[PDB]
Amino acid sequence: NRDMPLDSDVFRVPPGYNAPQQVHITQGDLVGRAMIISWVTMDEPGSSAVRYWSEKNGRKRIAKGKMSTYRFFNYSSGFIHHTTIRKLKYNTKYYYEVGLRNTTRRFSFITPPQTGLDVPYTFGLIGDLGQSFDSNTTLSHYELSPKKGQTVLFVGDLSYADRYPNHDNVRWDTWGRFTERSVAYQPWIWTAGNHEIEFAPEINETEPFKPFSYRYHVPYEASQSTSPFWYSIKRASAHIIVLSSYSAYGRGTPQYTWLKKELRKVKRSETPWLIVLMHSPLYNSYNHHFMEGEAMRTKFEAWFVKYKVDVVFAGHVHAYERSERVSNIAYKITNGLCTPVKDQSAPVYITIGDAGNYGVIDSNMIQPQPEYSAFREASFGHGMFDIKNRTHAHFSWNRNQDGVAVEADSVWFFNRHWYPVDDS
Amino acid sequence: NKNRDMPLDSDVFRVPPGYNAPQQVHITQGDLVGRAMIISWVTMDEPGSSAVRYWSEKNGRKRIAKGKMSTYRFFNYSSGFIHHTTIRKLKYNTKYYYEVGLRNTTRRFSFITPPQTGLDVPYTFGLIGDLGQSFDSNTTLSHYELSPKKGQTVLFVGDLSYADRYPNHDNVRWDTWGRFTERSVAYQPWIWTAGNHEIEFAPEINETEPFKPFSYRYHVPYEASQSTSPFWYSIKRASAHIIVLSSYSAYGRGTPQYTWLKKELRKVKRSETPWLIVLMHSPLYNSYNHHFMEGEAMRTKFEAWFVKYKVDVVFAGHVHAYERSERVSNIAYKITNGLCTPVKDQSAPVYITIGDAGNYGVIDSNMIQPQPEYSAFREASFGHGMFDIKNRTHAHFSWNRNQDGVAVEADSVWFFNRHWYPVDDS
Amino acid sequence: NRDMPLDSDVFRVPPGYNAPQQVHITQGDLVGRAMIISWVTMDEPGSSAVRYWSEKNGRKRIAKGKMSTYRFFNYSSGFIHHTTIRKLKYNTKYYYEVGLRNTTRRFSFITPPQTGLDVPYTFGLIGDLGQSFDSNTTLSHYELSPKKGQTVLFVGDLSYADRYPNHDNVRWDTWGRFTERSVAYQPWIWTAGNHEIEFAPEINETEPFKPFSYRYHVPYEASQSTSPFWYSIKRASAHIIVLSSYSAYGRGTPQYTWLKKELRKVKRSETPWLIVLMHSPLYNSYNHHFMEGEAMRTKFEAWFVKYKVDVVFAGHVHAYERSERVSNIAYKITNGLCTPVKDQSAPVYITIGDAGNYGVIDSNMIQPQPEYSAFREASFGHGMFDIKNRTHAHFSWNRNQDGVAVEADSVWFFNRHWYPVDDST
Amino acid sequence: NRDMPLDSDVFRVPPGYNAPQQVHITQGDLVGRAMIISWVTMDEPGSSAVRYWSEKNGRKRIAKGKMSTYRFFNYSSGFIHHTTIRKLKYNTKYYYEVGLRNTTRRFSFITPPQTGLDVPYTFGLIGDLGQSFDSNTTLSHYELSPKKGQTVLFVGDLSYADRYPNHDNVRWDTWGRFTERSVAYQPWIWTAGNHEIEFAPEINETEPFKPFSYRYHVPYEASQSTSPFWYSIKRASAHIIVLSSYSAYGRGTPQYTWLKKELRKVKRSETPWLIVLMHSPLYNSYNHHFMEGEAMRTKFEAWFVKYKVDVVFAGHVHAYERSERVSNIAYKITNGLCTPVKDQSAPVYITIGDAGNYGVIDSNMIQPQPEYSAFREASFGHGMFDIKNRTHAHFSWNRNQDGVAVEADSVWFFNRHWYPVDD
């Protein structure tokens, strides 16, 4: 229906023999002194080396990485490169080059400041991007934001290649080339959504998350996680926890065990902003995917309140919603306590899965609007979480049909540790 | 005192004599309908042969099936040589002998294949959970094997050896458990469910593959029901369709297990197997203090499916005690409508917790008071269950306590089939 | 450059979605009751199932096999299928079909007679085939031969894909489509030559024989070999031993150990004809590859004499040569005994690497023709080893430039065990 | 049976919980600035970290390595560690420590001087060592040599564990503990002999060299080899080429292809001494294994003459032999040129497989002694290749029945590139 055609300008192939394409970066360590650099070469393996240097020092260094390939049904990937640059200086612009053997391409990024209590930083929020014309408009709006996002928190559902026949993994390549104009210059922090599962036993593809996991690496060992699908990083004044809605989280499982330990490592005097990313929302008053989040909610919601998470970001529902600060953790089967109540130790739950997908919005809502829902609207767009300091962060939502500087919704987050005031 | 595990020199742990004698012999159903058997054993002195020699009493024709040997390491433990061999194309309702260790020390055993699946085929299933290797465990197993109801197959709802309570999960305690349970499971299949003591996720000793020792030692015929994982699968046996679930695997919407179960419930034909039985480790209904509400997560996913498909019974363990629910459901909840109380629902399964076979000697006696309406009967005693199918409409469940005689049932109830005879059996 | 271009008729793709191509069969067991069926599908994995039935009876059965794929530099193969049909009846025509899920293709083969002393059987001899116009002519001559070859003994150097840039493995696919018109209907017995090594560290391909070994499977475990590159089969009245010139054969290595035990298992009272295949010739009087066979000769020649091997076939030299029965096994470094002498207990050594390759013949011969060389000529062509009974086999060599019925060289073999009499020309 | 029993003092287990045992080192790079550190822990995996520092400066650094395990029939190995220390300073004594988590053990080595034309260096030659009482004597004689060996060139046949029932791989562990008293302190340069093949299809062990290759790593990638069984290193003024008698070496095979290119890289103005190690001798006048080396000789002898190899060392024959400088490379099947002739561009071929094995010597010799044989004797012992400078190196053979300072055979090597005097 509305997916951009293969010959669209956003899908053009970087010219020259074996030119790197689908270039993308993300944070490569726990505190921001490292960057994972990733790209694909189509004509031959090529080299996995990255040349990099700061604008100031100017001393050029080489980092070595690794190449991998995969198959999916009758698809054969090109040559995938992942290379980690390490021991970078904080708050510094670096250039990097890939394709060192045949066609070199140059890019740049800016390391975050060192982690600290009072360190401003602006996060973009994008979920369920896809590669429709709507997707392209959302990305344009983010790039043109006057607030200037410095990192994208991506709440999952990347390419939607699995909607195509045999999950036509070409649509992973096109999505890589489409997003390069943003993610080659600033990290995107990856969350796994249901369109990344790609469980297709009918064509003998039964390894969950396979194409996504080959194409997008994350620094999961840096937080002592055993799986790429849940992990944490710190960046500026934020501690960001990424969870996997489609992995196990029963008591005693790896993800549950890891998250319980991870929450104990949080130090709000170093990173006052505690942020959780997951694909499927625990609070959601849209009909589509209603109550799908209940299972994870039974395991994790009380932990979020106990540790005073500031905000939880999710996607999956193709629309926008912002909850009140509520909790629904008092239920004991026979005591009848199953209704959410205002709770100032609880996070705000934000659904931001509306960046475009394959061109369809979720407009059917549960009626009436429940007390726990502060704002909801079925429009395309993206968010910005703008940390001013340890007490204040400004969240805004920009609609695709508005000007790039118009915020149809916006709210001040008051920090749950340093300033726990009603921000209704 | 504090430790009730049986000592390493106990008679139940003795090593069968002879060079490279097979030990830890165990069998389970090896296909979808009962014409195959997975034969498993360990040799300790050298790899040995994975051949099984076998013959029916009725035809006396000796045959050879070939299998595979495997090994694993766990921290500083190195396993012996694990053999799994599937015997196929067995005749129904037929007694077979089989032999393992064909190269050096041969040992002979026997089993009886079930009748062909069918509407009115009687069959008696044992129910054992959280068995362990304490003296209480030995007593439960004795009561099972001395039962005049005579179980023909054990439905085992998880937590096997409890080896993971030992330092570095001392996998020697898996070997002892295998030698101990052999006197039953070498002669009749046990249907394996994975419990939380099978997870053995221990990153501090760089052992991060969930279920590894369990999965090397206990194979299941999971491909036969088009499952992609040993931890959830289905078998049919006599008049029963048995669905085994994994509490400690993913079951979110779109995951392999969730996808497999949705499809498997639509393949169920109650005109062929009228008794629909679900095994899982962690109970969805549980009024004991220990592990209270741990099953809530899977309940939000699957309970409505069990009601829609009129599951007859759900068996679970994990709680070290016995409980039998009423037929109830709690599937009307919509966040803001306040409908969170379980109600009687004749379309729902009975939920039975039967994790009381012994573990490491500890019973769970703290119950939430008063007994809730959804709970029909509960008791903190060691024992085992029996699910005795008479025909498409009637099955008789009974619970036997270790402190009673082997022929005494302390709880019992008639199941009226939800598909063929849905009359009120409360 | 005389390689046939890609649009040649011999390289055409079988029509229909995911149609099997590059179909080829070989013996699948030790004695001839089994057949390995191999093929590639290009559009998607497909089924590895093979449907088969005998022409007279007709009970259609299914055999299940395996699919594999590989990469070589920036090449990605299609989906390779290998499936063994077992427990066939001897001397029986069978139909078989592949591509069961989408586009089915049907072929046939005739199982050999049960092994016996006097069982006639006609073996083709083809080496260093390649895909030039000369290659196509040789294959044409073989398939039109009035002698009617029933199984090809192939002494190595298949596709010559490794002469292309990055070994362009597309030229393995084309060769499979070209050869199918013969090897889909009768087994070819595969020997690994030096163009199969494909050792290319400069493009990080360091696994020897990788493309060859993915595409061409052999029944090596049936003779207790641990490697596909050396193995043994029996067919009709012949015991055939296949060796790897480019694998280790020092004392104590797998191949040396295996050959030693295998020769002990030979029973000439059951299979009278003992035949060795290897790529590199032990006896070779051409300048090209002169004396490359010496290393293996020092290890195995004395064994071939001890066990009275009837014939040894090799390729590698792009020409034809037939030796006298000779041996060179008395050398002791300082005793001066280094000349081949006549030896009635030795095999005849035949170089038959002249099926066409990429169109070049090896014409530089060392002069004069040495006493050990009975006949040699630098012409393209192929051979036929035509077994008549336990005492007599007729060998003939047919040149591409002659008519298909013209034997330019021809000799009767007297079996070294059952008719140990001088058969020299 | 003359193998030392399991309770011999040489086989004592280092005490302490999870104490490293079987510690051994070898050169870790092409030119000598790196060291592969190897050891086994038996009680649990432990850490693969190596702590090391130079004795003068003293800055303590950590290198991270890798742990591996293997099975052979019914044997399960301990936890094998391999860790490369890199970027070391030349001609410098270093301390290193293994077993950093529970029981630490400390050793030392001395890096060689930087490669160069006139750098002196003393190499021990040991072959077919084994773990018999003769083996212990040879190793004692080597340790006590007044010439002071600084690196051992080991021409193969290590533990002889494969003579035991099911190749009882415990006899690899005992050999590792026995040789530690030398190889933990100076590199041994490993060659693979026939007792390392361990190809045993009758007990379903069909991977050649499996136990050896898990236990003893070599820096084969540093010379662009694709296999651990052939490689080259440079140390001081020597270029050392290690070949594999029981791998493939036909034309076009990886080993053949590698050797041809490696010989092209030798620069005799940087390393004047060109040394080849292989297990099976190309020249051998003993009855045992006579002419087993002919196959490799047909492929590589002409290359050795063409590139003027100084010396070729081999083992396999359980005895000592030293050849004249000869070549036998003119044979063309019919031309009758099959007798070795004096050739001053050819190497000397030395058989030194007499360090003890399991207690048997090879005494039956071809009679009369052929002209290509300069000296031969069936006694246990070891050799020393003592490089003085670019022109002169002194080779000596010490018998176990003699005093540790007595040379029963002794010859000057005159360098084939800088001083090709008739020797």
Ligand SMILES: *[C@@H]1O[C@H](CO)[C@@H](O[C@@H]2O[C@H](CO)[C@@H](O[C@@H]3O[C@H](CO[C@H]4O[C@H](CO)[C@@H](O)[C@H](O)[C@@H]4O)[C@@H](O)[C@H](O[C@H]4O[C@H](CO)[C@@H](O)[C@H](O)[C@@H]4O)[C@@H]3O)[C@H](O)[C@H]2NC(C)=O)[C@H](O[C@@H]2O[C@@H](C)[C@@H](O)[C@@H](O)[C@@H]2O)[C@H]1NC(C)=O
């Ligand atoms: C599917 O399985 C269920 C469970 O097994 C079947 O239900 C059982 O059916 C059997 C009959 O086959 C019932 O047993 C019978 O019970 C009567 C009534 O006993 C009661 O009253 C007596 C006085 O009237 C008293 O003496 C007795 O102590 C008890 O209090 C018995 O009278 C009867 O015994 C006599 O008849 C048999 C048959 O000729 C003789 O052999 C005896 O020697 C006696 O002369 C017999 O034991 C049993 O009670 C049922 N169990 C339950 C839990 O309901 C079911 O059968 C079907 O359903 C039942 C309710 C009846 O309608 C059956 O007729 C009917 O077939 C099985 N379904 C099918 C389709 O087979």
Ligand SMILES: *[C@@H]1O[C@H](CO)[C@@H](O[C@@H]2O[C@H](CO)[C@@H](O[C@@H]3O[C@H](CO)[C@@H](O)[C@H](O)[C@@H]3O)[C@H](O)[C@H]2NC(C)=O)[C@H](O[C@@H]2O[C@@H](C)[C@@H](O)[C@@H](O)[C@@H]2O)[C@H]1NC(C)=O
């Ligand atoms: C084993 O196989 C060989 C080769 O086929 C047999 O030798 C061949 O026997 C043929 C007879 O069946 C000969 O053909 C005849 O030749 C005569 C003389 O010109 C013609 O008049 C007649 O019409 C036939 O064409 C053929 O010449 C001969 N081939 C050779 C190379 O010698 C062999 O048969 C046995 O040996 C020969 C020499 C004769 O004595 C046969 O009669 C005899 O049976 C076969 N062995 C057996 C046991 O059958």
Ligand SMILES: *[C@@H]1O[C@H](CO)[C@@H](O[C@@H]2O[C@H](CO)[C@@H](O[C@@H]3O[C@H](CO)[C@@H](O)[C@H](O)[C@@H]3O)[C@H](O)[C@H]2NC(C)=O)[C@H](O[C@@H]2O[C@@H](C)[C@@H](O)[C@@H](O)[C@@H]2O)[C@H]1NC(C)=O
């Ligand atoms: C696997 O690793 C565990 C953990 O280290 C081993 O268990 C430990 O063995 C130690 C012996 O090396 C024990 O220490 C000694 O205890 C005795 C008796 O109290 C003291 O007299 C002595 O001075 C030592 O302190 C240690 O207690 C034990 N640790 C634990 C947690 O059990 C294990 O070794 C195996 O089990 C023990 C019980 C001994 O019998 C060992 O000999 C035996 O190998 C390791 N297992 C394997 C298979 O290697």
Ligand SMILES: *[C@@H]1O[C@H](CO)[C@@H](O[C@@H]2O[C@H](CO)[C@@H](O[C@@H]3O[C@H](CO)[C@@H](O)[C@H](O)[C@@H]3O)[C@H](O)[C@H]2NC(C)=O)[C@H](O)[C@H]1NC(C)=O
């Ligand atoms: C695997 O890698 C090889 C080696 O590069 C690829 O072949 C090469 O493909 C390039 C095009 O990308 C060819 O260069 C072009 O040649 C034409 C004709 O002269 C010229 O007009 C262009 O401007 C450009 O320079 C190159 O010749 C060719 N080399 C060969 C065929 O040897 C090959 O396509 C790759 N295969 C796969 C499956 O990716």
Ligand SMILES: *[C@@H]1O[C@H](CO)[C@@H](O[C@@H]2O[C@H](CO)[C@@H](O)[C@H](O)[C@H]2NC(C)=O)[C@H](O[C@@H]2O[C@@H](C)[C@@H](O)[C@@H](O)[C@@H]2O)[C@H]1NC(C)=O
């Ligand atoms: C963190 O950033 C906040 C957003 O800029 C600060 O609040 C803003 O402070 C301005 C000057 O102090 C004032 O003009 C703005 O109206 C105000 N904005 C809002 C939404 O309140 C905040 O400043 C502190 O907190 C406020 C409430 C005042 O009391 C200021 O005097 C404080 O300095 C910043 N907080 C810190 C700790 O720096």
Ligand SMILES: *[C@@H]1O[C@H](CO)[C@@H](O[C@@H]2O[C@H](CO)[C@@H](O)[C@H](O)[C@H]2NC(C)=O)[C@H](O[C@@H]2O[C@@H](C)[C@@H](O)[C@@H](O)[C@@H]2O)[C@H]1NC(C)=O
């Ligand atoms: C390399 O070392 C050789 C062994 O020491 C030197 O030969 C020795 O030179 C001594 C003078 O320093 C002399 O006393 C010894 O007789 C002699 N030893 C032998 C076995 O010849 C060699 O010296 C050169 O070569 C010899 C033959 C003499 O002509 C010396 O005067 C030369 O300097 C050393 N070569 C070099 C280049 O240093």
Ligand SMILES: *[C@@H]1O[C@H](CO)[C@@H](O)[C@H](O)[C@H]1NC(C)=O
């Ligand atoms: C995508 O958006 C960019 C920037 O807004 C625009 O230049 C480009 O034409 C768009 N491409 C498509 C296919 O809509």
Ligand SMILES: *[C@@H]1O[C@H](CO)[C@@H](O)[C@H](O)[C@H]1NC(C)=O
């Ligand atoms: C190959 O030979 C066949 C049979 O002689 C012929 O029909 C075909 O045209 C030839 N193809 C070539 C020469 O490309």
Ligand SMILES: *[C@@H]1O[C@H](CO)[C@@H](O)[C@H](O)[C@H]1NC(C)=O
């Ligand atoms: C081995 O040799 C050493 C050094 O000479 C000696 O101290 C030791 O006792 C010997 N051990 C045996 C078992 O011969």
Ligand SMILES: [Cl-]
């Ligand atoms: Cl749980």
Ligand SMILES: [Fe+3]
């Ligand atoms: Fe989505």
Ligand SMILES: [Fe+3]
């Ligand atoms: Fe339990």
Ligand SMILES: [Fe+3]
């Ligand atoms: Fe050729």
Ligand SMILES: [Fe+3]
């Ligand atoms: Fe030896």
Ligand code: NA
């Ligand atoms: Na909970």
Ligand code: NA
């Ligand atoms: Na039978």
